Nucleic acid binder design. Sequence first.
DNA 1: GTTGGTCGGCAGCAGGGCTTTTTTTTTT
DNA 2: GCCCTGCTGCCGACCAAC
Lengths: 674, 669
Amino acid sequence: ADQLLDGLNPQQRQAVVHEGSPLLIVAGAGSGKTAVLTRRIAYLMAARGVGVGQILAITFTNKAAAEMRERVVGLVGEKARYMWVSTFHSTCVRILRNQAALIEGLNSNFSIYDADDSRRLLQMVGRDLGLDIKRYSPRLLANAISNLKNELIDPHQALAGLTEDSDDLARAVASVYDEYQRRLRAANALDFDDLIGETVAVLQAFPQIAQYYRRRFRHVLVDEYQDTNHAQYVLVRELVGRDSNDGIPPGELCVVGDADQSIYAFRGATIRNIEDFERDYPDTRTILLEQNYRSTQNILSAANSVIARNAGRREKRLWTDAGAGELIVGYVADNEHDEARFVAEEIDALAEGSEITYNDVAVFYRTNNSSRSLEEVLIRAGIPYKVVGGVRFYERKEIRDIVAYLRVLDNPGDAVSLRRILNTPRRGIGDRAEACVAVYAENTGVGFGDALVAAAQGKVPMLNTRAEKAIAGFVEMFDELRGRLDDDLGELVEAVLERTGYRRELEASTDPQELARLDNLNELVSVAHEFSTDRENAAALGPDDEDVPDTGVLADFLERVSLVADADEIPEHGAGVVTLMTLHTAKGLEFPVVFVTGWEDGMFPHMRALDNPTELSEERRLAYVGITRARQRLYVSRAIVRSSWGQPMLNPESRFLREIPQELIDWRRTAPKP
Amino acid sequence: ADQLLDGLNPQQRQAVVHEGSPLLIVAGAGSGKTAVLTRRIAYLMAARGVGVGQILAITFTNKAAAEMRERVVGLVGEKARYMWVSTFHSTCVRILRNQAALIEGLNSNFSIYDADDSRRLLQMVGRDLGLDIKRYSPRLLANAISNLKNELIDPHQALAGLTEDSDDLARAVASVYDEYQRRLRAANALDFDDLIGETVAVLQAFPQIAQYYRRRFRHVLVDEYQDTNHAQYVLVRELVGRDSNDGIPPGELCVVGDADQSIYAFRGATIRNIEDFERDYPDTRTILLEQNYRSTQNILSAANSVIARNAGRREKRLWTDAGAGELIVGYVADNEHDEARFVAEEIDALAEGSEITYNDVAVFYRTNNSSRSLEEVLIRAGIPYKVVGGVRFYERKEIRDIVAYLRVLDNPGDAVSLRRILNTPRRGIGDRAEACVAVYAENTGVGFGDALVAAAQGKVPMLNTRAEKAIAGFVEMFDELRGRLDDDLGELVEAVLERTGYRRELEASTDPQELARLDNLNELVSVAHEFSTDRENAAALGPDDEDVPDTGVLADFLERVSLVADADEIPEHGAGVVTLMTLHTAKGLEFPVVFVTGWEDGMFPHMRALDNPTELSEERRLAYVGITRARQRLYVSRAIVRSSWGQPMLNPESRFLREIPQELIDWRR
DNA sequence: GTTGGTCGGCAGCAGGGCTTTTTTTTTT
DNA sequence: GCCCTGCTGCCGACCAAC
């Protein structure tokens, strides 16, 4: 009864199902962000009754997937876990696992790369045509290769990359692109963005699999489609939205979102997709999302102001019947910004002064630089604490080494990731010679395979290791340790990996003031083995239906090695002791308590984001998304004298702090800083 | 406490202990300089403390910056890292606009330095080919654009509005070259640039940076002005100075007793900037200085008397005392400049070496290339002339040649140099060396070493890369045989040097600012220098060291290795140093013997600057800084009738020679 | 018939040869 | 002491118009 039409804003009631046509839905502020998605899945279950197992929706965050899954198993219920809904990268690995290698070219025992290893591989391959370590930095190479990968130039681009005429700024990476694809194929692994490029190329070049793998799933549902790059736009045009031309009615293809949450657009997202969706299936109605669950009249007015007047976008009057009052804290004055901290003093002092139960706080970052470091060295006073989003697992050098050693267990041939560093515990490896016996053997034809096992036994090249084949003995022992293996139990670093055990004993022996490093290494060993203990079988696999070819059998961490969606952990007793989270990761979470830096342009537009580029509106929009936030007590603060990070810099007065009105919402009143 | 309070009578360190802006000293050469600077900062240490940069300090270039930093590390207990106190305004502005953001696009970092002032030279050469006339000379006319920028005068607007005479080319090239370099600025090697300019405009721009600048690090210390101007004066008045505009507390601006040197008077530095503090910040009463250690009591007192000639009105009550004293020498040998001065300095130096070590024996010259073969003087005290080569260690210019004889006419012993050939702009990209092939190629040969693998076409290391053998063998054959056959005279552009200049000209035809363009002039002047050596080495009116051409060119190359080695290892023990002292380096070297010549007229001036009584005044103070640039002992000698090539320029009398009461300066002959 | 003009080229004769410093937005 | 170029004075030949 009420379950079909559970209590909500009648706005989504008139939005309703409207099954039988492509559907577009708008967003803005909270607007039950992805809660309308839960009501949509409830619609599909009950209001229309499409089924249970015919669901494959698409999202942009693993945390979003987890929260919507728990909401579904709560309200929708009926376990509903045999079938699943997964985020964009997780759908990528899904279509590369259930559809792993039922196709020519790539094989089912593939792999995935990361950011740092992509940078390292691109830098190494560029060293073959060296263009200085600083002229074309690996970060620059990575962003350029991504923003040329985002357009659909499939990996036969001897015409596409060479189509350029004259021009400057390194199209040579397009020449390196074919060799890059060759090297990654040598390890049978892909990158972030090409992980959809291969799929869309197959779906466009291989027609037999199309309208054939749809016999498994016919349903699709989209959220934050407003945040979308051209690559995944073509994907939704062909893969998840599926039907382009021809004509086959799928199961309720549907999208939601608006251009105002246009965060994550600088390095590739064509925000126009929602604007020009009439180029796609026109038979849908624009919705009017107007109300909210957790806003306030003052803050909603501020959001509408910071969305209204920068330049041309489409937006409507947005407000809610919720309670008003508690004007925004416009208290900008003298007495120092953050040089003498004094901000965390405001947060925590107001916390014990008021009824704050250490369960709610929110402050956003501005930069990936030492802003975090200073913010820490000023909140160390606050004892109730938990650091989040600081990048703390699966990037360090030593832990990457051990991750690689898990990875070298399988897939003989793993590019530069295969070696990572061969001379890892200062073995004594003469990194030379073998650094180029690879090109020696690739002149013969083999890239990095038999040449590696070409050792004391492999005198086929016999290319004078140094003069003494001692390095041949070392690499003999290396392939020996590669060969030995055991089951998914207490051996991942310890039992049959006694060489990594001796790595551990060496590092524990040396350990100059690296005691916390020792305990974090121990914690990572513990989590690695508990993943071999808590996940294992039964609890993870169980009697679950559906067919998976090879994942699970020593493919344990082959999946979830990426998990690249900014996972976050939310306790309840200490839910808001310290929740310093950078705004980019923040996507309208549940902390009414706000003390965000927010504004005062000169730092809010970054050192590169000067003058008037074509993305300042994106900055205003990310500020709007940050202020979307949650319920009352948004006790924001600012000063007037700016200086930070050693050498001082000055900060002009923002138009965003001025586009919000002066009288109807509170602004500077007196001299105290907070 | 006063653990850093050394033995010193009250007068000098009054500027160290007496706090307050209106403090001045009168100090000549042989003063505390950085000693008193460090003592003042240590007094402030006993006082307020670091505060990162509570009081700043303007200074001279790196020659002063390095020793200042050393004194800061040593004299006060604190280790280092107070703040940037690097080479005066040239680094002050650079570190300032790093965070300041008004108009910069790529952090400015411009210098109009040797390469870039040569870029100025080439662009005005183009304008000469295209606008009016030679306009005096291609050199020494950049003074116009310099003092145009130096005193921050308007680019060309009222200069043309001034309606001056036929010099409008200056206004044209000021309208140009103000925006011609505006698209992008890069590279930093010199001092002046527009860096000292256009930063007052930043201070005259948004006053937030100006307000905070003396809010977080308050004020600055000002050293010897010298390399300044009235525009630099208003900078120091406002760059760190507050001008009592909005700042509540006043400025702690004490001033060092800038003596009269004008080492860059050619580059522009007035006199009223130091002598006329009256129409400035409060009168800043001065204090006297007494202690000195440069020269003996006789020499020191006589120098005090000599500096008191007062041709230009100068505040001088300073006296300097010392220990022993002695009279000046009287050795003149009726010109014979080369032979006479060489034998005089040789006999005196040997007599000294029988008593005192050669570790700092040297001589002062007047910016000319003359005198006997340098081998004898260089082997007198071990190390070669480590004075100036325009820091020539840059690009391939100093190394490709200096290995050209390694590869042919002797063994290529410097295998690291050989790898540097393998690091050629050719061997890097053009005739690329294939690092991932070369490193192993020279690694091959078990008993590897030198270019032995490159030798014999690499028959033994043919286990190397196979398809690469085409290009690898071709570049190997080039680099070995083409150089090996080189047995001719080998100058100008030939052998392979013509190919080197050829592809330098190839990159010259492209965009880069003098890059591969100035080095063409550099190799032209280098072959001019080797021709000059041939004037005294190969065709030395009868060969000096040309026992068949091979050893002559090799002797030239060893002279070059000496020049490029300059200051190196083999510490200064025994036969320590021989150097040729120039005016522009006249600071830092103790120089405990002074066998200087040219104190007479004829060259001071040399018909360029004859009457010009003010110019004669700074030439007199040039003589003062020359005489005060000494240590320990000194016995100056001269020659008469300088018969040079046909122009004698007889100088029997000078306004410096015989105005002394002869208490010290008397020739006894 | 003849001296002044105009260049063309070359031996003497003298002015003139001086200059100090490099770093950071898509971030998932 | 020694070289580059500008300045200066000095042989030597072809044209002309008076």
